[PDB]
Amino acid sequence: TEQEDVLAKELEDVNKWGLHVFRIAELSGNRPLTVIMHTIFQERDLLKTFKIPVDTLITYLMTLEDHYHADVAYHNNIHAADVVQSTHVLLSTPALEAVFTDLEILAAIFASAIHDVDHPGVSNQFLINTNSELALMYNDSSVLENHHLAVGFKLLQEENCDIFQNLTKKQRQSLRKMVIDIVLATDMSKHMNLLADLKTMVETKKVTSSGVLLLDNYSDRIQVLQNMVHCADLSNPTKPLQLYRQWTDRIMEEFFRQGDRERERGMEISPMCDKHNASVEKSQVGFIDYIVHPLWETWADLVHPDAQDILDTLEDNREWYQSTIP
Ligand SMILES: CC(C)CC(=O)c1ccc(OC(F)F)c(O[C@@H]2CCOC2)c1
Ligand SMILES: [Mg+2]
Ligand SMILES: [Mg+2]
Ligand SMILES: [Zn+2]
Numbered sequence: 001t002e003q004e005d006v007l008a009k010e011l012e013d014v015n016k017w018g019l020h021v022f023r024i025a026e027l028s029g030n031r032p033l034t035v036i037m038h039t040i041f042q043e044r045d046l047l048k049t050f051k052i053p054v055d056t057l058i059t060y061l062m063t064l065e066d067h068y069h070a071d072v073a074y075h076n077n078i079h080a081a082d083v084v085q086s087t088h089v090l091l092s093t094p095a096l097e098a099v100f101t102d103l104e105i106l107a108a109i110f111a112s113a114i115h116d117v118d119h120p121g122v123s124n125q126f127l128i129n130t131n132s133e134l135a136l137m138y139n140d141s142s143v144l145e146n147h148h149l150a151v152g153f154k155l156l157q158e159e160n161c162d163i164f165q166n167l168t169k170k171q172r173q174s175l176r177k178m179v180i181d182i183v184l185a186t187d188m189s190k191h192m193n194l195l196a197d198l199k200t201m202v203e204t205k206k207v208t209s210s211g212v213l214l215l216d217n218y219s220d221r222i223q224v225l226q227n228m229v230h231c232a233d234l235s236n237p238t239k240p241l242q243l244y245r246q247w248t249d250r251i252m253e254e255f256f257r258q259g260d261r262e263r264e265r266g267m268e269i270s271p272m273c274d275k276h277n278a279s280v281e282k283s284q285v286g287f288i289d290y291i292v293h294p295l296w297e298t299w300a301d302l303v304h305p306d307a308q309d310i311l312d313t314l315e316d317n318r319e320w321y322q323s324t325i326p
Contacts, residue, residue, distance in 0.1 A: 003027060011039050017089055017310060018240045021082045032081035033068070034061040037113055040088045044109075049102050051166035060161040067117050067151055073253035075119035080112070086232035087112040095303035097212050100221070103167075107175050108225050111182035112232060114152025119144060122258045124187070129267065142187045149183050178222060185226035186233050195295055198227050202301045213302070224302075231299050237284070237292050238314040252280055281324045288318045 007027040013019045014036065025032040038057065041047055047054060068077040087108055091100070100108075120127075120134075124143045127135045138146045153176070156162050164172055185194055201223065206214040215221045236247035252272075259273030272283050296314055300307040 007035065011035065014039050014043060014085060015089060015092065017086075017238075018243060019082075019085055021078060021085065021243070022246060025078045025081070030070070030077070031062070031065060033065040033077045033084065033113060034058065036081045036085050037061050037109070040084065040109060043088075044105065046102070046106060046109075050106065050164070052163050053165075056160055056165065057163050059159075060155065060163045061113075063155050063158055063161060064113060064117060064152065067155065069119065069121065072119060072121035073257070074247070074250040075116050075121055075254065080114075080116055083115060083229070083232045083235075084109060084112040086235045087229055090228050090232060093303050093306045095211075095213055095306050096224075097210070099213050099215060100225070103171055103175055104178065104221065104225065107178035108182060108229060110152075110175070111179045111225075112229055114179075115148055115183050115186050115229065115233065116144075117148050117155075118151045119148070121254050122261070123270070124189075125270065126258055126262070130265070142184055142189070145184050145187045149180055152179075152183075178225070181222050182226055182229050185230055191230070191291065191295070194223075194227055194230060195298060197223055198295075198298050198302065202298055205302065227295075227299065231295060234292050234295060237288050237317050238296060238310045240313065241317055241320060244317055248280065248284055252278070281321050284321045285318060285325070288314065288321070293318065 007024065010020055010024050010027060021032060021036075024036065028035045038061065041052070041057060046052065047057065065077050065080075068075075068080055070076060091105055091108060124135075124140075127143050128140045132143075134143050134147055137143075156164065164175065167175065184190070201220065208214050213224070215224060236244050236251075238244075239247070255270075255273045256275040256278070259269045259275060262269050262273065272278055293314060296307070296311055300311045
């Protein structure tokens with residue numbers, strides 16, 4: 001109960017950017033995804049709203065969590081938990097108050113939970129280049145992201161795992177489509193097009209009498225949710241530095257392990273995957289400059305000024321990593 005009370009204490013920070021997610025992973029007995037999802041569902045009253053039996057939720061979450069690979073350094077259950085919690089915070093931004101329905105909120109959070117499930121710790125390109133069963137199944141197109149969806153949905157049909165059992169047929173249909181649209185948008189090959197569309201929305205932005213975003217069609221609604229979960233997926237450099245550095249340690253380990261597999265096969269080693277020739281700090285600065293900051297700056301514009309502190313942290317972290325280079 002002492003460890004249980006300390007875990008309960010930590011989970012009180014679930015509405016905050018910079019939650020101690022690694023501490024939660026250890027305190028929960030390597031069940032960060034389960035406890036964070038359960039906490040968020042309680043916080044948002046989702047069990048009552050969708051008549052989700054508590055035991056069904058926990059059973060599904062435990063099985064979902066099990067299907068993340070404990071031996072993968074970055075794309076594991078802790079990352080899933082982190083993206084879920086980050087999405088949860090982004091959904092609560094003042095500029096979006098009362099914009100999304102309960103079903104849309106459920107879709108975004110569920111999509112976040114399943115978005116990397118059964119990740120093998122290697123990239124789409126590696127899977128394509130090595131003629132893997134996954135690339136063959138999915139015809140080289142969003143290979144992993146299709147797989148994550150397939151696994152996430154299939155696990156609902158396991159014993160006592162259908163958390164959506166009390167949704168209407170129309171609700172289930174809508175949720176399934178939304179979840180697919182969201183998880184496929186986490187494929188980095190879609191990033192530039194997603195960002196271009198987000199910029200267009202920002203430039204043509206409309207707000208209600210309340211000062212909240214006006215979204216009156218599926219296309220705009222789903223686009224915001226896609227970019228939201230994508231922002232959450234790309235949120236590591238916006239977190240307090242002690243968290244960001246741990247995420248960087250993990251992605252580099254994962255990248256280096258892929259590079260070792262490429263080396264052992266006699267393949268050319270992918271960018272940033274050679275442990276004997278890798279500039280970790282320069283690569284983080286490039287990652288921020290070319291990908292993460294352009295996205296988060298546009299998100300910040302969409303919800304201005306709600307995300308200013310997040311954007312400020314990102315800029316501080318870029319400066320920090322940059323400062324280690326000279
Ligand atoms: C979805 C995608 C961005 C996940 C990913 O590959 C990734 C996540 C966090 C990354 O870094 C840090 F945020 F943990 C990351 O960095 C690589 C290594 C240097 O630049 C690119 C990459
Ligand atoms: Mg596992
Ligand atoms: Mg992914
Ligand atoms: Zn991810």
